[PDB]
């Protein structure tokens, strides 16, 4: 599908170390946002995508 | 949740 | 409203260097995926959403 | 220019 990631990629994901690298923890604390809005996000397009599959189905039935 | 990523103990799973 | 980033906060986004910390390439280019999956998301939420709008206004009338 | 890139963001010089 068109998502690259999943909240569970998000979080399993591992990066090389290198010297004067990003500092991991606040990577981290940053990822744990990402996460949560990959969580928000896959929830919300299956809640929508989901309603409008039952009004499909009312809308071209007698 | 279970995927904070700053988990001290993250480690243990990934 | 639930989401905490938007794309352009993950283009933003600047961390500090430590020691031995996330090889900064790698970071970055993964950031460059979670963008696009922000874009993508936003806008299937955007269309998703108008969608079920319009399906409603068409069933809950004549 | 019309899809970000953090790489866009490093130092020109
Ligand atoms: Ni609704």
Chains 1, 3 share one sequence.
């Not at chain 1, 979080?11 to 940053?30: C, H, L, P």
């Not at chain 1, 744990?32 to 919300?44: R, S």
């Not at chain 2, 279970?2 to 799973?13: F, P």
Request: hydrophobic share 35%; glycine share 4%; aromatic share 10%.
């Amino acid at each position: 599908g068109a998502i690259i990631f999943s909240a569970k990629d998000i979080f399993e994901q591992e990066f090389g170390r290198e010297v004067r690298g990003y500092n991991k923890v606040e990577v981290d604390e940053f990822l744990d946002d990402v996460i949560k809005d990959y969580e928000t996000y896959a929830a919300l397009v299956k809640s929508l995508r989901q309603e409008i599959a039952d009004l499909k189905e009312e809308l071209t039935r007698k | 949740t279970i995927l904070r990523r700053s988990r001290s103990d993250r480690k243990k799973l990934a």
